[PDB]
Amino acid sequence: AGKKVLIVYAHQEPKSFNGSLKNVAVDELSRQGCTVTVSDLYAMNFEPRATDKDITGTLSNPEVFNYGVETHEAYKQRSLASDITDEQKKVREADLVIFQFPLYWFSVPAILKGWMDRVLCQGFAFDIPGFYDSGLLQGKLALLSVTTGGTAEMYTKTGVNGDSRYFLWPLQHGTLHFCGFKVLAPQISFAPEIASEEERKGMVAAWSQRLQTIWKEEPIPCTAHWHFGQ
Amino acid sequence: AGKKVLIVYAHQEPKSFNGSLKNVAVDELSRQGCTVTVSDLYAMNFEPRATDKDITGTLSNPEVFNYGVETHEAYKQRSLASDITDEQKKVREADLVIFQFPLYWFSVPAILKGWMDRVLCQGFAFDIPGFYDSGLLQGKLALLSVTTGGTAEMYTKTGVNGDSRYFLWPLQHGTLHFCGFKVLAPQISFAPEIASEEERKGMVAAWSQRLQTIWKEEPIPCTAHWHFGQ
């Protein structure tokens, strides 16, 4: 078969529970014979800000800077900053992109938000038209593997946080589905800091075990119904 | 009068539609006699990454870096980096915090997500008790003023993007409510880039007119039913 996996990883501490989930992914996917690449964004000191430094050539309109217009142009001309094109090459080759991160404010850490903002540019990840089911990364799979401070019960329809699915919408639908990815079901590892060292061990092994059969999974239907019900 | 307002603004171009919305807010609140401060994040080159540089001096466990713990302890001992403390002082004094940004991936641009991640730290914005209705920032108002590339029709419940309220959840509930803010209804300026020079003038003046009576508004009820319900 032969599959390539990119893990986009956003945690500052190699000994953390996120680091353990990234490491078990690399170990199990490597064991299976997959080709594996990890973008460890804090180690890379990955630049999160969307600025005019991300285009190196003559701007389309140097008088009034529009990041979307300028990057779309720079993508077509090949004048994006090289850190963006280095990530795009990894995504272009990947069959599966796994994002591994702690939930910050019901979303990704800013450094990973900046990866989405800068790497998934128009022309590369989507065109207008050419989005959602027609997005440019059609054929690829994506998977969010998230850790939380809040417990699974806090993340239910009647807990303080509401259902976990509700915070997934901007990431699954607005970002990944928009770019054409098929979205695998999220891995959510709840409250590892509260949990006993046994329960943590179990959450790590549950992810490892799921990865054994990841290429047999079908995606979610990434719709408003799946996220919010009715 | 007397009221203080902090505008946290995330756009690269002063001549942009966002720039215009931020400047009319300054003009109108300043004309009312309010005390106004603007954090222009791009112009500040505001650091978005959550890293051990956010703690000055001596880590409270430099064997296993835990950002939430380290920053919580740093805030209690007055040892957070001065860019964060400078923003915390603006927020502590403010009665209203307005966020002005273009929607990037159904969320805030990464530089503003970095402001949320690094300024709204434990001890300052939330605690046990006091997430949500201990929002430690209770008493304060917050308002998101957002611009989009997609049209209002795209942002309906059966439109491609789903209702606008769907993507507001992590920002209004998961972040603003959580820290104790009362949330004013969002100001959403749909698709300025392709609007006429007069639709745009319409949207800027709706904003300026809204701001004339901002202090008479009651917060939205920041609940799952508001965002997703009927």
Ligand SMILES: Cc1cc2nc3c(=O)[nH]c(=O)nc-3n(C[C@H](O)[C@H](O)[C@H](O)COP(=O)(O)OP(=O)(O)OC[C@H]3O[C@@H](n4cnc5c(N)ncnc54)[C@H](O)[C@@H]3O)c2cc1C
């Ligand atoms: C700015 C900010 C915003 C946040 N916003 C949210 C939010 O919106 N909602 C929310 O729910 N939470 C939020 N959190 C909390 C955050 O999501 C959790 O702190 C994070 O998810 C926990 O993951 P971790 O890897 O850092 O845990 P760690 O502290 O590294 O791990 C927990 C424990 O598991 C241990 N462990 C590591 N590896 C293994 C292993 N292989 N086997 C057994 N045990 C192991 C670790 O040593 C540790 O003791 C926020 C935190 C911050 C800083």
Ligand SMILES: Cc1cc2nc3c(=O)[nH]c(=O)nc-3n(C[C@H](O)[C@H](O)[C@H](O)COP(=O)(O)OP(=O)(O)OC[C@H]3O[C@@H](n4cnc5c(N)ncnc54)[C@H](O)[C@@H]3O)c2cc1C
């Ligand atoms: C990484 C990225 C992700 C994105 N993700 C999304 C998303 O998830 N969903 C989505 O809908 N969109 C998304 N967009 C598109 C984005 O939200 C819009 O491009 C942005 O909101 C447009 O607002 P602006 O200020 O940048 O418009 P501008 O281009 O600055 O302005 C529109 C026009 O009005 C002019 N103008 C300035 N001031 C005034 C004034 N006072 N009166 C009249 N005209 C004025 C400007 O010069 C310009 O010609 C994304 C864009 C990027 C780059």
Ligand SMILES: Cc1cc(=O)n(C)c2ccccc12
């Ligand atoms: C929004 C939210 C929910 C939650 O459950 N936890 C633990 C948090 C910890 C830090 C910051 C925000 C949260």
Ligand SMILES: Cc1cc(=O)n(C)c2ccccc12
């Ligand atoms: C997610 C999304 C919806 C949308 O309507 N538009 C215009 C976009 C433009 C660029 C990137 C994402 C979007």
Ligand SMILES: [Zn+2]
């Ligand atoms: Zn979807």
Ligand SMILES: [Zn+2]
């Ligand atoms: Zn709420």
